[PDB]
Design an enzyme around this catalytic site. Sequence first.
Site, PDB file in Angstrom:
ATOM      1  N   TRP A  58      41.340  31.889  31.763  1.00  0.00           N
ATOM      2  CA  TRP A  58      42.238  31.043  32.553  1.00  0.00           C
ATOM      3  C   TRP A  58      42.821  29.937  31.686  1.00  0.00           C
ATOM      4  CZ3 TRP A  58      45.627  30.832  36.155  1.00  0.00           C
ATOM      5  CH2 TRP A  58      45.973  29.654  36.866  1.00  0.00           C
ATOM      6  N   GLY A  85      28.297  29.097  20.002  1.00  0.00           N
ATOM      7  CA  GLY A  85      27.788  27.986  20.779  1.00  0.00           C
ATOM      8  C   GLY A  85      26.441  28.307  21.414  1.00  0.00           C
ATOM      9  N   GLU A 128      23.595  30.053  17.281  1.00  0.00           N
ATOM     10  CA  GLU A 128      22.418  29.187  17.344  1.00  0.00           C
ATOM     11  C   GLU A 128      21.192  29.982  17.799  1.00  0.00           C
ATOM     12  OE1 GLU A 128      23.633  25.651  19.615  1.00  0.00           O
ATOM     13  OE2 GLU A 128      25.201  25.231  18.166  1.00  0.00           O
TER      14      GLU A 128
HETATM   15  C1  LIG Z   1       9.723  23.847  23.188  1.00  0.00           C
HETATM   16  C2  LIG Z   1       9.088  24.248  21.860  1.00  0.00           C
HETATM   17  O1  LIG Z   1       8.203  25.118  21.785  1.00  0.00           O
HETATM   18  N1  LIG Z   1       9.704  23.795  20.747  1.00  0.00           N
HETATM   19  C3  LIG Z   1      10.586  22.639  20.543  1.00  0.00           C
HETATM   20  C4  LIG Z   1      12.094  22.999  20.427  1.00  0.00           C
HETATM   21  O2  LIG Z   1      12.670  23.442  21.651  1.00  0.00           O
HETATM   22  C5  LIG Z   1      12.874  21.805  19.855  1.00  0.00           C
HETATM   23  O3  LIG Z   1      14.121  22.228  19.354  1.00  0.00           O
HETATM   24  C6  LIG Z   1      15.112  21.751  20.197  1.00  0.00           C
HETATM   25  O4  LIG Z   1      15.393  22.706  21.140  1.00  0.00           O
HETATM   26  C7  LIG Z   1      16.502  22.395  21.976  1.00  0.00           C
HETATM   27  C8  LIG Z   1      16.605  23.475  23.029  1.00  0.00           C
HETATM   28  O5  LIG Z   1      15.711  23.214  24.082  1.00  0.00           O
HETATM   29  C9  LIG Z   1      17.750  22.310  21.101  1.00  0.00           C
HETATM   30  O6  LIG Z   1      18.739  21.793  21.969  1.00  0.00           O
HETATM   31  C10 LIG Z   1      19.967  22.385  21.558  1.00  0.00           C
HETATM   32  O7  LIG Z   1      20.460  21.722  20.431  1.00  0.00           O
HETATM   33  C11 LIG Z   1      21.670  22.299  19.953  1.00  0.00           C
HETATM   34  C12 LIG Z   1      22.079  21.539  18.702  1.00  0.00           C
HETATM   35  O8  LIG Z   1      21.573  22.128  17.511  1.00  0.00           O
HETATM   36  C13 LIG Z   1      22.742  22.237  21.051  1.00  0.00           C
HETATM   37  O9  LIG Z   1      23.798  23.121  20.647  1.00  0.00           O
HETATM   38  C14 LIG Z   1      25.359  22.326  19.614  1.00  0.00           C
HETATM   39  O10 LIG Z   1      25.811  21.033  20.060  1.00  0.00           O
HETATM   40  C15 LIG Z   1      26.180  20.938  21.434  1.00  0.00           C
HETATM   41  C16 LIG Z   1      25.205  19.989  22.085  1.00  0.00           C
HETATM   42  O11 LIG Z   1      25.232  18.742  21.421  1.00  0.00           O
HETATM   43  C17 LIG Z   1      26.205  22.300  22.125  1.00  0.00           C
HETATM   44  O12 LIG Z   1      26.841  21.979  23.359  1.00  0.00           O
HETATM   45  C18 LIG Z   1      26.522  22.647  24.528  1.00  0.00           C
HETATM   46  O13 LIG Z   1      27.318  23.770  24.434  1.00  0.00           O
HETATM   47  C19 LIG Z   1      27.300  24.601  25.586  1.00  0.00           C
HETATM   48  C20 LIG Z   1      28.147  25.815  25.258  1.00  0.00           C
HETATM   49  O14 LIG Z   1      27.504  26.654  24.323  1.00  0.00           O
HETATM   50  C21 LIG Z   1      27.863  23.776  26.754  1.00  0.00           C
HETATM   51  O15 LIG Z   1      27.787  24.664  27.842  1.00  0.00           O
HETATM   52  C22 LIG Z   1      28.938  24.389  28.562  1.00  0.00           C
HETATM   53  O16 LIG Z   1      28.285  23.819  29.650  1.00  0.00           O
HETATM   54  C23 LIG Z   1      29.100  23.380  30.727  1.00  0.00           C
HETATM   55  C24 LIG Z   1      28.176  22.757  31.763  1.00  0.00           C
HETATM   56  O17 LIG Z   1      27.703  21.491  31.339  1.00  0.00           O
HETATM   57  C25 LIG Z   1      29.900  24.576  31.275  1.00  0.00           C
HETATM   58  O18 LIG Z   1      30.836  23.942  32.140  1.00  0.00           O
HETATM   59  C26 LIG Z   1      31.320  24.718  33.240  1.00  0.00           C
HETATM   60  O19 LIG Z   1      32.512  25.478  32.809  1.00  0.00           O
HETATM   61  C27 LIG Z   1      33.070  26.314  33.824  1.00  0.00           C
HETATM   62  C28 LIG Z   1      34.200  27.081  33.175  1.00  0.00           C
HETATM   63  O20 LIG Z   1      33.897  27.360  31.818  1.00  0.00           O
HETATM   64  C29 LIG Z   1      33.530  25.424  34.990  1.00  0.00           C
HETATM   65  O21 LIG Z   1      34.195  26.230  35.958  1.00  0.00           O
HETATM   66  C30 LIG Z   1      32.332  24.668  35.554  1.00  0.00           C
HETATM   67  O22 LIG Z   1      32.697  23.787  36.594  1.00  0.00           O
HETATM   68  C31 LIG Z   1      31.660  23.843  34.451  1.00  0.00           C
HETATM   69  N2  LIG Z   1      30.488  23.133  34.962  1.00  0.00           N
HETATM   70  C32 LIG Z   1      30.213  21.843  34.722  1.00  0.00           C
HETATM   71  C33 LIG Z   1      28.926  21.319  35.342  1.00  0.00           C
HETATM   72  O23 LIG Z   1      30.946  21.138  34.026  1.00  0.00           O
HETATM   73  C34 LIG Z   1      30.628  25.298  30.142  1.00  0.00           C
HETATM   74  O24 LIG Z   1      31.237  26.495  30.594  1.00  0.00           O
HETATM   75  C35 LIG Z   1      29.677  25.626  28.986  1.00  0.00           C
HETATM   76  N3  LIG Z   1      30.413  26.206  27.868  1.00  0.00           N
HETATM   77  C36 LIG Z   1      30.231  27.449  27.409  1.00  0.00           C
HETATM   78  C37 LIG Z   1      31.135  27.865  26.258  1.00  0.00           C
HETATM   79  O25 LIG Z   1      29.379  28.203  27.893  1.00  0.00           O
HETATM   80  C38 LIG Z   1      26.994  22.549  26.960  1.00  0.00           C
HETATM   81  O26 LIG Z   1      27.504  21.720  27.981  1.00  0.00           O
HETATM   82  C39 LIG Z   1      27.006  21.770  25.668  1.00  0.00           C
HETATM   83  N4  LIG Z   1      26.234  20.535  25.760  1.00  0.00           N
HETATM   84  C40 LIG Z   1      26.724  19.330  25.445  1.00  0.00           C
HETATM   85  C41 LIG Z   1      25.734  18.156  25.548  1.00  0.00           C
HETATM   86  O27 LIG Z   1      27.914  19.182  25.117  1.00  0.00           O
HETATM   87  C42 LIG Z   1      27.016  23.306  21.313  1.00  0.00           C
HETATM   88  O28 LIG Z   1      26.955  24.611  21.886  1.00  0.00           O
HETATM   89  C43 LIG Z   1      26.457  23.409  19.887  1.00  0.00           C
HETATM   90  N5  LIG Z   1      27.511  23.432  18.886  1.00  0.00           N
HETATM   91  C44 LIG Z   1      27.980  22.353  18.227  1.00  0.00           C
HETATM   92  C45 LIG Z   1      29.059  22.639  17.168  1.00  0.00           C
HETATM   93  O29 LIG Z   1      27.586  21.190  18.465  1.00  0.00           O
HETATM   94  C46 LIG Z   1      22.272  22.667  22.433  1.00  0.00           C
HETATM   95  O30 LIG Z   1      23.160  22.096  23.364  1.00  0.00           O
HETATM   96  C47 LIG Z   1      20.884  22.150  22.728  1.00  0.00           C
HETATM   97  N6  LIG Z   1      20.330  22.798  23.895  1.00  0.00           N
HETATM   98  C48 LIG Z   1      19.958  22.171  25.011  1.00  0.00           C
HETATM   99  C49 LIG Z   1      19.350  23.073  26.087  1.00  0.00           C
HETATM  100  O31 LIG Z   1      20.092  20.950  25.162  1.00  0.00           O
HETATM  101  C50 LIG Z   1      17.556  21.319  19.969  1.00  0.00           C
HETATM  102  O32 LIG Z   1      18.586  21.435  19.013  1.00  0.00           O
HETATM  103  C51 LIG Z   1      16.267  21.606  19.231  1.00  0.00           C
HETATM  104  N7  LIG Z   1      16.007  20.552  18.275  1.00  0.00           N
HETATM  105  C52 LIG Z   1      15.774  20.831  16.992  1.00  0.00           C
HETATM  106  C53 LIG Z   1      15.487  19.650  16.104  1.00  0.00           C
HETATM  107  O33 LIG Z   1      15.802  21.998  16.564  1.00  0.00           O
HETATM  108  C54 LIG Z   1      12.187  21.016  18.702  1.00  0.00           C
HETATM  109  C55 LIG Z   1      12.701  19.584  18.473  1.00  0.00           C
HETATM  110  O34 LIG Z   1      12.809  18.733  19.614  1.00  0.00           O
HETATM  111  O35 LIG Z   1      10.791  20.881  18.980  1.00  0.00           O
HETATM  112  C56 LIG Z   1      10.143  22.085  19.226  1.00  0.00           C
HETATM  113  O36 LIG Z   1       8.746  22.070  19.176  1.00  0.00           O
END
Ligand SMILES: CC(=O)N[C@@H]1[C@@H](O)[C@H](O[C@@H]2O[C@H](CO)[C@@H](O[C@@H]3O[C@H](CO)[C@@H](O[C@@H]4O[C@H](CO)[C@@H](O[C@@H]5O[C@H](CO)[C@@H](O[C@@H]6O[C@H](CO)[C@@H](O[C@@H]7O[C@H](CO)[C@@H](O)[C@H](O)[C@H]7NC(C)=O)[C@H](O)[C@H]6NC(C)=O)[C@H](O)[C@H]5NC(C)=O)[C@H](O)[C@H]4NC(C)=O)[C@H](O)[C@H]3NC(C)=O)[C@H](O)[C@H]2NC(C)=O)[C@@H](CO)O[C@H]1O
Length: 377
Positions: A58, A85, A128
Site C-alpha cells: 500500500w 529487520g 537479525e
Molecule cells: C533472554 C535470553 O536468554 N537472552 C538475552 C537476550 O535476549 C538479550 O539480547 C537482546 O535481545 C533482544 C530481543 O529480546 C534484542 O532486542 C532487539 O534488538 C535489535 C537491535 O539489535 C532490534 O532490532 C534493530 O533496531 C530496531 C530497534 O531499535 C528494530 O526496530 C524494530 O523493527 C521492527 C521491524 O523489523 C518494527 O516492527 C514494526 O513494528 C510496528 C509496531 O510497533 C509495526 O507497525 C504496524 O504497521 C502496520 C503496517 O505495516 C500498521 O497497519 C499497524 O497499525 C502498525 N502498528 C503499530 C502499533 O504501529 C510495523 O509493521 C513493524 N515493521 C515491520 C517491517 O514489520 C519495530 O517497531 C521496531 N522497533 C523500534 C523500537 O523501532 C529494527 O528492526 C532493527 N534494525 C535497525 C537497522 O535498527 C529489535 O527491535 C530488538 N527486539 C525487541 C523485541 O525489542 C536485543 O538487541 C538483544 N541485545 C543484545 C545486546 O544482543 C541479551 C542482552 O540484553 O541478553 C541475553 O541474555
Amino acid sequence: SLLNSRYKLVCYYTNWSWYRPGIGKYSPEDIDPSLCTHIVYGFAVLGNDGLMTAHDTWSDYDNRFYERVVEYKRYGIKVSLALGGWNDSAGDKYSKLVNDPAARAKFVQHAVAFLEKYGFDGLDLDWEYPKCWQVDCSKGPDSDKQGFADLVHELSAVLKPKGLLLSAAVSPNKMVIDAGYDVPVLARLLDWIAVMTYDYHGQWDKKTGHVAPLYYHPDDDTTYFNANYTIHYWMEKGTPASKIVMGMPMYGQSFTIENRGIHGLNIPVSDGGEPGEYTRAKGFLAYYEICDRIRNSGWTVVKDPYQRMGPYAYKGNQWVSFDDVEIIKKKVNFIKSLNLGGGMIWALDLDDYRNRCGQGKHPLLNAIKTELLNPKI
Ligand SMILES: CC(=O)N[C@@H]1[C@@H](O)[C@H](O[C@@H]2O[C@H](CO)[C@@H](O[C@@H]3O[C@H](CO)[C@@H](O[C@@H]4O[C@H](CO)[C@@H](O[C@@H]5O[C@H](CO)[C@@H](O[C@@H]6O[C@H](CO)[C@@H](O[C@@H]7O[C@H](CO)[C@@H](O)[C@H](O)[C@H]7NC(C)=O)[C@H](O)[C@H]6NC(C)=O)[C@H](O)[C@H]5NC(C)=O)[C@H](O)[C@H]4NC(C)=O)[C@H](O)[C@H]3NC(C)=O)[C@H](O)[C@H]2NC(C)=O)[C@@H](CO)O[C@H]1O
Ligand SMILES: *[C@@H]1O[C@H](CO)[C@@H](O)[C@H](O)[C@H]1NC(C)=O
C-alpha cells in the site's frame, strides 16, 4: 554541510511510521535532507519465493513511498533499501536462503533488478541475525556464517561494478558477532557496517537498564554490553575504523518496575513500559514521547554524572532509558576520536522532528550533525 565532511550520517527511514496518529505521523516528505548523508529505507522483506519484495505494498508501491524517498537523491543523498529487520528475522527463511547456493544466485540477480527498478543507490542487509536468529544462537546452523559472507560476496560482485552500495546493520553483541559474522569478509566488502550499538537493555532483562550505554559502568553485569566495547570488538576482529558507522537510538526502552518506591538502575521489572500514544508498542517510546513526559507529565530525569550512559526517566511504575543531547555529543566525540566512518540513527521518525518539546526540530539528530561538523574532538 554533512556531504562535504569526512563522516557519514546514515538515517533509517521506516515505512510504518506513516501509520501513526496526529503529530506522530511521518511521511517521506518529512525527511529533512540537510540532516543525513545516507537514507536507508526500512524495510523490504524476503518473500516466500526466496526473493526480495515490498513489505507494505500500500505505502511502498501504491502510494509510491519508494519513489518518494528515492526523491532525496536530488539533494545529493545516497538512498539505500534495507532488507530484513527484526520482524522479518523471526524464522529460518534467511538461513534457508543463505545455505542454498542456487537460491542465493536467483535472489541476487533479482535484488539488483529490484533496486534499479526503483532508483535505489544500494542495498542494506538487516538480517537479525546469521546463526543467532533473533539473538537465539541455538536456532541457526554454523553454516549461516559462511552462507551470509557468500551472500555478501555475491551481492558485492554484482552491485559494485554498477556503482551501487552494499551495507549491513549488525549486532553489537559479542556472542552474535563470534557465532554469525565472518568479520573480515564483511569488513572488506561492505561500504559501511552500521553497528547497532543500542538495545543492550530492555524488558527482556527483567531489570531496568540503559538502552545504549557508551562506556562500561561499575554496576553493570557485563563488561561487554556498551558501545565502547562493541566498537573495539569489531575493530579487533578486523574492521577498519572507516567502515564503522556507530548506531544511536532516537528512542527509549521502557519498563514497568515491580514497585514504585525503587527506581534506580538494575531494579526488578515486571513488564515493558506502557505503550506510547503514538508508537503504540509496549517496551519503547519515541524521544518525542519521552521528552513530553518529562516536560509536561512531571517525569523525573536522572542523569549519569560519570557520563557512561544517557539519562533515565521515571514516574510511578514507569521507567524509561534513552539518549539526551548531552550523551549524544559525547558519543559523537567518541566517533571522531576513533576516526570512525560516522554515525547512524534508528530512526528519523522517532526524534522530535515536529519540535513538540521546544528544543528545536530534530534535537537529537541536529546534535549529531553539529558535533560531527565541529572540528574539535
Ligand atoms: C533472554 C535470553 O536468554 N537472552 C538475552 C537476550 O535476549 C538479550 O539480547 C537482546 O535481545 C533482544 C530481543 O529480546 C534484542 O532486542 C532487539 O534488538 C535489535 C537491535 O539489535 C532490534 O532490532 C534493530 O533496531 C530496531 C530497534 O531499535 C528494530 O526496530 C524494530 O523493527 C521492527 C521491524 O523489523 C518494527 O516492527 C514494526 O513494528 C510496528 C509496531 O510497533 C509495526 O507497525 C504496524 O504497521 C502496520 C503496517 O505495516 C500498521 O497497519 C499497524 O497499525 C502498525 N502498528 C503499530 C502499533 O504501529 C510495523 O509493521 C513493524 N515493521 C515491520 C517491517 O514489520 C519495530 O517497531 C521496531 N522497533 C523500534 C523500537 O523501532 C529494527 O528492526 C532493527 N534494525 C535497525 C537497522 O535498527 C529489535 O527491535 C530488538 N527486539 C525487541 C523485541 O525489542 C536485543 O538487541 C538483544 N541485545 C543484545 C545486546 O544482543 C541479551 C542482552 O540484553 O541478553 C541475553 O541474555
Ligand atoms: C574503551 O574500550 C577500550 C578497549 O576495550 C579500553 O581500553 C578503554 O579504556 C575503554 N574506555 C573506557 C572509558 O572505559
